[PDB]
Design a protein around this ligand. Structure first.
Ligand SMILES: C[C@]12CC[C@H](O)CC1=CC[C@@H]1[C@@H]2CC[C@]2(C)C(=O)CC[C@@H]12
Lengths: 55, 127, 337, 233, 240, 233
């Protein structure tokens, strides 16, 4: 309709003028979070059995 | 983005011929069944034809059965509907549509209103 | 109308050219010299049995012991996964419940499905049972996901192409989130509770600000119905799951799919997606009766959690990120660790 | 185990005792999905059956001491691919058809192709009700609407030898009746491969036997499921 | 003679019944339906029957009165438990094919275990109470009046129930297929329809019918394996 | 939530009286309920416990073979029949409410009391050594507690419960499982300890907190209560 397509364009204009930092910087920040919280992931490094609460 | 842009269509005479093309971008065309759905003025949507992955499951609605033919091309990601002989009760907005999920022949809610993976439309007028 | 639509396409062209020039590198080559995650062997410690129909959804508690599970028998069961005990059982008016949430205080459990009503259940009652705290109604579609913000505020994603923030004490919509053109299946709250992403059946995920009811930004790259969505643990990224046998990781600052998680042998649909506590092991949940565990930075399976008999409808990792609860359509929930 | 742990294990066992009591209720009731079009007499099949015996309405009828839940959708939208997976363990699907109209049969056939072939709606049998037989009887005797326009395979068709015409029925009506069934059964007998079965019935709007028709079909469905448990089928 | 095949048959029954029990108790995906749990109890009866019979055929050299009777108690109880579980397999199909609805009784298998393991437990106890000498002679019943009251006569109660349900299965399986050989033959070896060869075998009419009682009814546990464990697609999928 | 008690009076020694506490205001079948008695110038001593939907019946050593506790779930009444009443039976008996699950609050609601006046080892000694403490409003008082056996189970929950008995009122739960706070209690109260020795800390002591403070062990099945710590003004 005429009403919906006005909203599509006002949404996309509001979407287009945002700030985008580079993906290589965005990839590095996600990489840095996983390496910093490496000990804070029992799914990655297995917890000793005593610690596991589901043993 | 799932963008189905279908060209073709126009003011054709009765007994004329038209090919409706359908350019599709943003998805692997060879993994999905594709559909044609038409909406005649003020009587809702109606399913027309459906070709499966690499053909071999072509089925039609009854009113266009001997007349219209569908063909997919899994190289340019293009869908075709060749219309051979047109009555003037075939006037509609014809839409390129797609089966909801991939790897299946289970086309639910293709003719449903506000369907996402359906084209913008192309007008075929017969007079 | 055609002046509007062509303007809308060149905004899409302006965005796509902005995203293309924003991608100098990719996560495949930024993370190509880190150590591989290795094989993550992981088995069931607890087979939680007692449901009568398919376990459609679950949600963990914040103390990582309690979890509620929704099933199509008309029951919510609160489980103690440490000891396999049933802490509570909640009978429902409607047996078609498609979601449940556990509040981050332990005081309430929501549910919602085809009855178009978010039923809040008061757990910590003086009278000694569960009752219906609030029948949040107003949606005109099935409630597919709900998540509690903090103890009086809940966002509910619905089948009427809308999300809605509700005040439980008044029963009303404080804000409403519209813009999706298809059925909205899942929502995920960022870990500071100010933004939320919703994945819907129009091959797009929208980031919404909960404080003024608008969409910041729309994430495309998927090609079928998104049934699963989950934030990264910091809050700057989120992964999605859909029917196209792909999981895609979307950063909120640079708007791209940084990695597709998709092999060629996988042909089914992803029903559930949740990260670990670090975001190195993306656990997804599929329709091949299995739960593949992806490395979130290198696109390879770290192991398959294969112990279920039907579709794994729900999959959740604890808030200390130490146990994974996968519930399936075979009425069994399984604690992997 | 401590003193509070052993009472908590007991409190699980009283929830076992409540849920095994509710498993007696759940297995003895049979969930059925009423999914039909708006033109069809779907609300009439609600109304007639419940006298004789919100996004979901629920109709419960009891025939020969057994329970039968029936659910139809209300405020749900016309997109039908995500909520239809919830009804994957229902006993049967009632697909009510307005057989009298002809411009919307093929929409109901494409609805019927979608339900019958779906990867989660498979192993569910369909109790096909072909409603509006009385107005179909008036329309064919009038002869105003030609079936051959919408379906160009009604010309090379003949009535089947195993047909059962009710007495005082014109042969054109019976030819029109069983054509709509065979359009609806070559959908079902092409992809099921002995996983689920279609039960077609020619029903009137105000017929008072549709509960017995469901019960006779639902007896077969749970019979066939039990034969597969010994792999007899 | 048959004695020989008897020993290779009981061995081939027992070791492939053991494959059936380790498959069904460990793999939980093939145990959800009620025929599967009755199948395990029938296989557990038929496993223990063969092992005691092979024990009764080679460890009968001891002439102690106590255990000659004991082993004859254990051979009698395991034979009557297996006959009862054959009948309860037939009884379950009356509550699955004839009476199709309202057949979920809570603790359904547990009520069948009281009928399957305890109704034989009463009747072996009371004939031991009347006169224990009967069991202790190969230690088998020497009284021979209770051979036709408790062994054969109780089997005749089972056999008329099992054949009548076997007819009803053929009555039902026609009425779908009017409106497959592996399927029928499974119901033969599940219910002991082929145990009706004993009525000819015990009479001196044919050596052949005596042979068929030895080749089929001894290899029943082998045939339960290749019609309800090896012949199911879900079991073979879960073996990988 | 109301637990009013009936029965009790002037019972001659060797007699028999049945005590019933009625429950109007909470669900009865979900709570496992105890009987605790208060001697006139002594402390509290637990005598009975029946589970919710009765499966285990625990008694104390002094009331083991002579008392019986039964449970009427439809009529919301808890029965305590007594035989062979010795003089020590003299006491005012409380009807005690307790649910047991993870994160639950046992001993949360107590009754009101019914005066009974009879006419003329393995148990954990919960010693207190805190008979009296001179207190003023506003200071931060500490109430001590010691156990004969360590109350820290291998779960991680150390089973220590605190009660406040006002001078003319029933006891009220303050903190449970060592330090879990109860619902109506203000944030002034705080609990600590190390498995064997224990400490309750009232930090902003007001006028309504006058009374005798009791400790508890819920580790062993036979529950014991402390002598009492009276915070008089
Ligand atoms: C089958 C059965 C009885 C059932 C046992 O499981 C196996 C068995 C042992 C040898 C068989 C015996 C029945 C009677 C037989 C068949 C004979 O007469 C000779 C060997 C005997």
């Amino acid at each position: 309709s005429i009403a919906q397509a006005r909203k599509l364009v006002e949404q996309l204009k509001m979407e287009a003028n945002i700030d985008r930092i580079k993906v290589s910087k965005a990839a590095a920040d996600l990489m840095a979070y996983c390496e910093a919280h490496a000990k804070e992931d029992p799914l990655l490094t297995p917890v000793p059995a005593s610690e596991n609460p589901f043993r | 983005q799932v963008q189905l842009q279908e060209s073709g269509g126009g003011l054709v005479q009765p007994g004329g011929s038209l090919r409706l093309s359908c350019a599709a971008s943003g998805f692997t065309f060879s993994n999905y069944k594709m559909n044609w759905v038409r909406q005649a003025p003020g009587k809702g949507l109606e399913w027309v034809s459906d070709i499966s992955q690499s053909g071999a499951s072509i089925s039609y609605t009854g009113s266009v059965k001997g007349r219209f033919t569908i063909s997919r091309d899994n190289a340019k990601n293009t869908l075709y509907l060749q219309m051979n002989s047109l009555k003037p009760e075939d006037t509609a907005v014809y839409y390129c549509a797609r089966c909801p999920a991939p790897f299946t022949r289970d086309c639910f809610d293709v003719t449903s209103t506000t369907y996402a993976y359906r084209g913008q439309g192309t007008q075929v007028t017969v007079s | 109308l055609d002046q509007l639509r062509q303007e809308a396409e060149q905004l899409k062209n302006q965005i796509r050219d902005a995203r293309k020039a924003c991608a100098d590198a990719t996560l495949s080559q930024i993370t190509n010299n880190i150590d591989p995650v290795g094989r993550i062997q992981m088995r069931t410690r607890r087979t939680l049995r007692g449901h009568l129909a398919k376990i459609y959804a679950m949600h963990w508690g914040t103390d990582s012991r309690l979890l509620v599970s929704a099933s199509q028998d008309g029951k919510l069961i609160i489980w103690d996964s440490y000891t396999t005990n049933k802490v509570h059982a909640i009978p429902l008016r409607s047996s078609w419940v498609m979601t449940c949430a556990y509040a981050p205080s332990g005081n309430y459990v929501a549910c919602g499905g085809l009855d178009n009503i978010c039923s809040i259940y008061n757990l910590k009652t003086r009278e000694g049972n569960v009752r219906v705290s609030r029948e949040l109604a107003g949606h005109t579609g099935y409630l597919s996901c709900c998540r509690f913000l903090d103890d009086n505020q809940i966002v509910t994603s619905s089948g009427d192409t809308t999300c809605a923030l509700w005040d439980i004490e008044t029963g009303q919509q404080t804000t409403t989130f519209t813009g999706h053109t298809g059925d909205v299946m899942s929502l995920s709250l960022a870990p500071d509770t100010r933004l939320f992403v919703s994945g819907a059946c129009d091959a797009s995920a929208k980031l919404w600000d909960v404080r003024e009811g608008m969409c910041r930004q729309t994430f495309t790259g998927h090609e079928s119905d998104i049934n699963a969505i989950c934030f990264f643990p910091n809050g700057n990224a989120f992964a999605t799951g859909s029917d196209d046998a792909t999981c895609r990781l979307f950063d909120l600052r640079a708007d791209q799919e940084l990695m597709t998680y998709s092999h060629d042998n996988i042909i089914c649909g992803i029903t559930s997606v949740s990260f670990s506590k670090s975001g190195r092991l993306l656990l997804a949940g599929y329709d091949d009766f299995n739960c593949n565990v992806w490395d979130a930075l290198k696109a390879d399976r770290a192991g398959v959690l294969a112990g279920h008999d039907n579709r794994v409808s729900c999959l959740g990792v604890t808030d200390d990120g130490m146990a994974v609860a996968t519930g399936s359509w075979d009425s069994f929930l399984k604690i992997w660790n | 185990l401590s003193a509070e742990d052993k009472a908590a294990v007991e409190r699980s066992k009283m929830i076992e005792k409540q849920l095994q009591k509710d498993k007696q209720v759940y297995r003895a009731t049979h969930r059925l999905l009423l999914l039909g079009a708006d033109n069809s007499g779907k609300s009439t099949i609600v109304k007639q059956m419940r006298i004789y015996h919100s996004g979901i309405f629920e109709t419960k009828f009891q025939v020969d001491k057994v329970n039968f839940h029936m659910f139809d959708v209300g405020a749900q939208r016309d997109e039908r691919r995500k909520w239809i997976q919830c009804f994957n363990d229902v006993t049967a699907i009632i697909f009510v058809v307005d057989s009298s109209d002809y411009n919307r049969l093929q929409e109901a056939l494409n609805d019927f192709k979608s339900i019958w072939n779906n990867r989660w709606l498979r192993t569910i049998s369909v109790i096909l009700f072909l409603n509006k037989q009385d107005l179909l009887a008036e329309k064919v005797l009038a002869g105003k609407s030609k079936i051959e326009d919408y379906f160009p395979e009604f010309a090379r068709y003949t009535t089947p030898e195993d047909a059962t015409p009710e007495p005082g029925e014109d042969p054109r009506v019976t030819r029109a009746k069983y054509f709509i069934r065979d359009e609806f059964l070559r959908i079902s007998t092409a992809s099921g491969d002995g996983r689920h079965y279609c039960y077609p019935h020619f029903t009137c709007s105000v017929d008072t036997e549709n509960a017995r028709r469901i019960f006779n079909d639902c007896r077969d469905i749970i019979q066939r499921m039990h034969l597969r448990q010994y792999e007899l089928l | 003679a048959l004695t020989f095949i008897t020993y290779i048959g009981c061995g081939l029954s027992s070791i492939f019944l053991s494959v059936t029990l380790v498959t069904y108790i460990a793999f939980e995906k093939i145990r959800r339906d009620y025929p599967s749990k009755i199948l395990i109890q029938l296989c557990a009866a038929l496993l223990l029957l063969n092992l005691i019979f092979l024990l009764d055929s080679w460890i009968a050299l001891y002439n102690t009165r106590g255990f000659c009777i004991a082993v004859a108690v254990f051979l009698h109880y395991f034979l009557l438990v297996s006959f009862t579980w054959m009948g309860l397999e037939a009884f379950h199909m009356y509550l699955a094919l004839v009476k199709v609805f309202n057949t979920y009784i809570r603790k359904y298998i547990l009520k069948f275990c009281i009928v399957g393991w305890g109704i034989p437990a009463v009747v072996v106890s009371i004939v031991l109470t009347i006169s224990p000498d009967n069991y202790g002679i190969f230690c088998w019943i020497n009284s021979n009046v209770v051979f036709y009251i408790t062994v054969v006569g109780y089997f005749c109660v089972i056999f008329l129930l099992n054949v009548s349900m076997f007819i009803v299965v053929l009555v039902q399986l026609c009425r779908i297929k009017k409106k497959d050989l592996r399927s029928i033959a499974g119901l033969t070896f599940l219910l002991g329809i082929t145990w009706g060869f004993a009525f000819f075998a015990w009479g001196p009419v044919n050596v052949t019918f005596m042979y068929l009682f030895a080749i089929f009814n001894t290899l029943q546990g082998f045939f339960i394996f290749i019609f309800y464990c090896a012949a199911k697609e879900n079991v073979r999928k879960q073996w990988r | 939530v109301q637990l009013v008690e009936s029965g009790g009076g002037l019972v001659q020694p060797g007699g028999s009286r049945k005590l019933s506490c009625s429950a109007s205001g909470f669900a009865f079948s979900s709570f496992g309920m105890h009987w605790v008695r208060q001697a006139p110038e002594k402390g509290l001593e637990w005598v009975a416990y029946i589970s919710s939907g009765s499966g285990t019946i625990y008694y104390a050593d002094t009331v083991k073979g002579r008392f019986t506790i039964s449970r009427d779930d439809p009529k919301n009444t808890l029965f305590l029949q007594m035989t062979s009443l010795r003089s020590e039976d003299t006491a005012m008996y409380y009807c005690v409410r307790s649910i047991y699950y993870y994160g639950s609050s046992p001993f949360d609601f107590w009754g009101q009391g019914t005066t009974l006046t009879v006419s003329s080892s393995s148990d954990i000694v919960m010693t207190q050594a805190t008979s009296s403490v001179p207190v003023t409003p506003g200071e931060s008082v500490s109430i001590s507690c010691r156990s004969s056996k360590s109350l820290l189970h291998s779960n991680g929950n150390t089973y220590l419960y605190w009660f406040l008995q006002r001078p003319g009122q029933s006891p009220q739960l303050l903190i449970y499982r060592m330090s879990n706070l109860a619902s109506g209690v203000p944030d002034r109260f705080s609990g600590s300890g190390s498995g064997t020795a224990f400490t309750l800390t009232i930090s902003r002591l007001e006028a309504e907190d006058v009374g005798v403070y009791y400790c508890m062990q819920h580790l062993e099945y036979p529950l014991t209560f402390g002598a009492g710590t009276k915070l008089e003004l």
